[PDB]
């Protein structure tokens, strides 16, 4: 079945929002977020911290899902996946399917889904409330193809983050645009000038 995943931001009843590190745009930066563009700029396979902020702690058994989609165009119905150079290369972590663009690092409770109905790829982790004295929870995502690998790239790629309960009920949704590139700090600077 076709699908056009919702992009609609929805804090819901726990006040679910995203946060990113304020990393600036030095040469050395591997991952930087633009508030102005609502856009991440990261390197392939590198760490991208994404914070989850909540006004009320959701119940035990809550889960966090990420899915990439093409934001717009004739590509809206196209499942985002890795290119052949990257799909068929030597880089499995033993947990991620080789086609999945998005991975989570450093979590042995990560789970990967090819949807049996829509064929969309997604990655889920358990929601862990922040440690006492911490304000948010952080997930380290890794993006496993560059923006240049993507065939719809008539279209930006959007990461959609959803909070869901143990039964799959949606509690919250947020999203940001994502560029996988050689020089995140330079491309952000450049894109904001534009
Ligand atoms: Zn690729």
From Swiss-Prot:
Changing residue 145 to G: In LFS; germline mutation and in sporadic cancers; somatic mutation. Changing residue 84 to A: In a sporadic cancer; somatic mutation. Changing residue 58 to S: In LFS; germline mutation and in sporadic cancers; somatic mutation. Changing residue 157 to M: In LFS; germline mutation. Changing residue 187 to G: In a brain tumor with no family history; germline mutation and in sporadic cancers; somatic mutation. Induction: Up-regulated in response to DNA damage. Isoform 2 is not induced in tumor cells in response to stress. Changing residue 148 to Y: In sporadic cancers; somatic mutation. The modification N6-acetyllysine is found at residue 27. Changing residue 153 to I: In sporadic cancers; somatic mutation. Residues 23-194 are annotated as: Interaction with AXIN1. Changing residue 79 to G: In sporadic cancers; somatic mutation. Changing residue 102 to Y: In a sporadic cancer; somatic mutation; requires 2 nucleotide substitutions. Changing residue 136 to S: In sporadic cancers; somatic mutation. Changing residue 133 to N: In a sporadic cancer; somatic mutation; requires 2 nucleotide substitutions. Changing residue 96 to G: In sporadic cancers; somatic mutation. This is Cellular tumor antigen p53. The lineage of its organism: Eukaryota, Metazoa, Chordata, Craniata, Vertebrata. The chain holds residues 94 to 288 of 393 of the full protein.
